[PDB]
Design a protein around this ligand. Structure first.
Ligand code: HEM
Ligand code: HEM
Ligand code: PKL
Ligand code: PKL
Lengths: 373, 373
């Protein structure tokens, strides 16, 4: 762990995200901040075309250009979708698309808003001395008023932070596998399982901050993409950067590195002969920061912990490994239970495909256990 | 150069491939060796459907179970595509599917024939002592008679080898970036550039040995997979193993580890952007020997050569870099020249999707140049 951009406190989240851009990009910042207003009042799209072409070079360091990608991503989502009710836009203005794509190419990310810049790069502590707890922090950007995006992004971010506690351990696991020290390894697996169960609570204790009208709410349509989307059948033209419409997938927490990482570590079959599930999740790595998608790979570069633990005929080891897998099914489940409270409930007078997707992943997790319970 | 299985003399190719399996696997070694005979006669699908389900216990050392993969592989393509005319099989026999997937999950490869299978692990020396040259060499397997097998696989392999002479220069490039030895880098870069030049020269001098009407021969039908293939809507069933029909891509020379690794090294980033071709080559990585994707990624873990050369304001070093890109572009252009000559022209008396895919891969290589202003 050196140049994988995994922070030891906040994990895959961008630590202390920059919340102010150079004055040069104030018009960008303005539209972005006042997203909820500009949309409902209708002038957003106008205020977007009002923008002249700005160069991205004044974005000197990593963090600033990161905030830029957030600012522009939102602006883009706001522009494409508008009030969200159906008035789409098939062409993104050159004075936005060109900077967006240039910077997007630079940071190695598709020119669409992703989990990495919408959750992990979209936050700040209120009082910089009080710890990272919900009541001490806030988002930087939301789409419309009462979309609960504050709570949605913040909790996910909090679960993301909570998982970092286990990342620290990973080298210990691979090292303890190499030098062949059962006791250290077993010890370390329990510690991971311990941290993954710690993540369950931040999920439990903090599920209070999303309103049952959040899917059916204005969100979800703002995180919608233009890949296989009937509304932009062929994708969005990024005017002055691409002669042709390009398709990019929308938002999915499949772009959260955390869960993929431990899916990999524990050898949970996430390539399992393809299938929408394992395949989707894979090509969702293309939407992760180049350093994180790189860390993921690197884990598979390492030998399987699952193949090791099997072969040792070690009861305490299996249980320890099972304890981690149990921790994931627990996580996936409470997530799934929370999801059903949000899809067949606000289906009141497409949403069942997701229900399957979740369940196939969770199932692949469950089938990984070594004691059937 | 460590645990990546990159032979000093033969690159990514299997060091010295095993010709004969263990005595046990003779029910297989027979079929595959007499495979052209058995397709035309229309007895292949039958002989396979009446076969002993030999267990994978007796194939042990690396060279053997890779030969096993090749054998089982061709057999599977023969059994699915039949004569190459219409008639198709959607299910693979328990007796041959199960030991194949047992060996596939074992060797961490997908249960389809691969470039690594039928090019890297498919050859021999007629005269064991003398150099690796065309006439000195012959393949181990084929599908039909005059089906263009030898030349295609052999020329590929010979270019793959020719290119490998550079893989050994890779560590220096990263050492010279670390120790910061400007001269050493420039030198090592010119050498890599020259290795690519030499491989194009090899391509020139042996291009003929590939049969002029190879694309249209049954070959392409036998190298067809079951991923986004209309003919196998849901993909092949490996029954006994997985109850569901599973989905895997047919052979593409985008599984050639060398070409991808020079893309990576020079920072051509074919694997970035999330676009159609971007996601493809990234997915083809899963169809490479495990030892090999790891190496590809290691390269990706390392600092960017392109970045380093851009930063230094060093025209000599810039030039030596371009030399490499030009050399990789030349390599691709000549390839595209012969692809046009073999596939476009004879179409008259998908054919475009292929031409487009190659062109972008070439274009995004040509675009990686430096000295432009
Ligand atoms: C509380 C409101 C939430 C709802 C309604 C919700 C809904 C969903 C839905 C519908 C999917 C499948 C569609 C997709 O993203 O591809 C999903 C996937 C996912 N969600 Fe959430 N989610 C919520 C909160 C969270 C939180 C707090 C986390 C933790 C960071 C999380 C992590 C994930 C992950 C990792 C996936 C990918 C599926 C997997 O790996 O199993 N979600 N979510
Ligand atoms: C002259 C006979 C050949 C023909 C007709 C031919 C045709 C093609 C076609 C149609 C593709 C795109 C389909 C795909 O693989 O996804 C392709 C890709 C490719 N071919 Fe060939 N090929 C030939 C010989 C070679 C040889 C000898 C090599 C050297 C190993 C080579 C290396 C590649 C590579 C690396 C790709 C991936 C795309 C790229 O890197 O630009 N080909 N070839
Ligand atoms: C840019 C971005 C990406 C992922 C997340 C995120 C964090 S936690 C989580 N679970 C699911 C998602 C997600 O965005 N999925 C798409 C569908 C969907 C989106 C929002 C609400 C609903 Cl109800 C359904 N997500 C947040 C932002
Ligand atoms: C399993 C396997 C994979 C790749 C190769 C190979 C080595 S060099 C090269 N160029 C293209 C390919 C290739 O097979 N691509 C598929 C399209 C195609 C192109 C030309 C002729 C035909 Cl018959 C088919 N290829 C050989 C075996």
């Amino acid at each position: 762990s050196k140049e994988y951009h995994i922070d030891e406190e906040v994990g895959f989240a961008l630590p202390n995200p920059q919340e102010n851009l150079p004055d040069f990009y104030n018009d960008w910042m303005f539209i972005a901040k006042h997203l909820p207003d500009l949309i409902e009042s209708g002038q957003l799209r106008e205020r977007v075309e009002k923008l002249n072409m700005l160069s991205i070079d004044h974005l000197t360091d990593h963090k600033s250009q990161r905030l830029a990608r957030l600012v522009l991503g939102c602006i883009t989502m706001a522009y494409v979708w508008g009030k969200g009710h159906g008035d789409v836009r098939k062409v993104l203005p050159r004075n936005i698309a060109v900077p967006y794509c240039q910077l997007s190419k630079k940071l190695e990310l598709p020119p669409i808003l992703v989990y990495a810049d919408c959750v992990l790069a979209n936050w700040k502590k209120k009082d910089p001395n009080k710890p990272l707890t919900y009541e001490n922090m806030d988002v930087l950007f939301s789409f419309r008023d009462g979309d609960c995006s504050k709570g949605f992004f913040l909790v996910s971010l909090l679960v993301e932070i909570a998982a970092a506690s286990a990342i620290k351990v990973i080298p210990t696991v691979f090292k303890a596998m190499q030098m062949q020290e059962r006791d250290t390894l077993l010890k370390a697996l329990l510690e991971i399982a311990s941290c993954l169960e710690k993540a369950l609570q931040v999920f439990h204790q903090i599920h209070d901050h999303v309103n049952p009208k959040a899917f059916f709410s204005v969100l979800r349509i703002y995180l919608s993409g233009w890949k296989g989307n009937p509304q932009l059948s062929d994708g969005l033209v990024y005017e002055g950067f691409w002669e042709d419409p390009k398709e990019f997938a929308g938002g999915s927490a499949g772009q959260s590195s955390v869960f993929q990482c431990f899916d990999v570590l524990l050898g949970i079959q996430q390539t399992a002969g393809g299938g929408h599930a394992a395949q989707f999740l894979q090509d969702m790595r293309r939407y992760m920061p180049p350093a994180h998608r790189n860390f993921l790979c690197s884990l598979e570069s390492n030998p399987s912990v699952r193949e090791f633990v099997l072969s040792k005929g070690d009861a305490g080891l299996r249980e320890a490994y099972d304890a981690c897998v149990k921790a994931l099914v627990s996580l996936r489940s409470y997530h799934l239970q929370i999801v059903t409270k949000y899809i067949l409930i606000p289906a009141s007078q497409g949403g069942t495909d997701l229900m399957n997707f979740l369940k196939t992943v969770r199932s692949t997790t469950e089938k990984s256990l070594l004691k059937e319970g």
